C-alpha cells in the first residue's frame, strides 16, 4: 500500500541489473534439464511484477525474500563458472545493498 511505488522502483532497478533478461521469465525444464527436480520454489522477475501489480506484497521483507529466492535458485542450479551463477551472485549482493537501510 504505502510501499507499492517503492517496490515498483526496486523491481525496475533490479531488472536493469539483468540487461540480458535471464531472470525475466520462468525457467522451464526444456531450457534447463532437470530444473523442476532440483528447484522446489521457482521465481522470476515477471512473477514478481505480477505480484506487485496485484498488490500481493505486504512488506518490503516479502519482496526481498522473493528476490533472494530467485537468485538462490540460480546459484543452486547453475555451476559457479557460468554467466547465470555469476549474475545471480552479483545482483543478489547489489540488490540487497540497495534495498537495505
Amino acid at each position: 500500500t504505502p510501499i507499492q511505488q517503492l517496490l515498483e522502483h526496486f523491481l525496475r532497478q533490479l531488472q536493469r541489473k539483468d540487461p540480458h533478461g535471464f531472470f525475466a521469465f520462468p525457467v522451464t525444464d526444456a531450457i534447463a534439464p532437470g530444473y523442476s527436480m532440483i528447484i522446489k520454489h521457482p521465481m522470476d522477475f515477471g512473477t514478481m511484477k505480477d505480484k506487485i501489480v496485484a498488490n500481493e506484497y505486504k512488506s518490503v521483507t516479502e519482496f526481498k525474500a522473493d528476490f533472494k529466492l530467485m537468485c538462490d535458485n540460480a546459484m543452486t542450479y547453475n555451476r559457479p563458472d557460468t554467466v547465470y551463477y555469476k549474475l545471480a551472485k552479483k545482483i543478489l549482493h547489489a540488490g540487497f545493498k540497495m534495498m537495505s537501510k
Binding site: I31, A32, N78, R79
Partner: peptide, 10 residues
Amino acid sequence: GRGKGGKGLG
C-alpha cells in the same frame, strides 16, 4: 546436461 541451452551472450 545441468545448464542452460544457450551461452547467454547476446
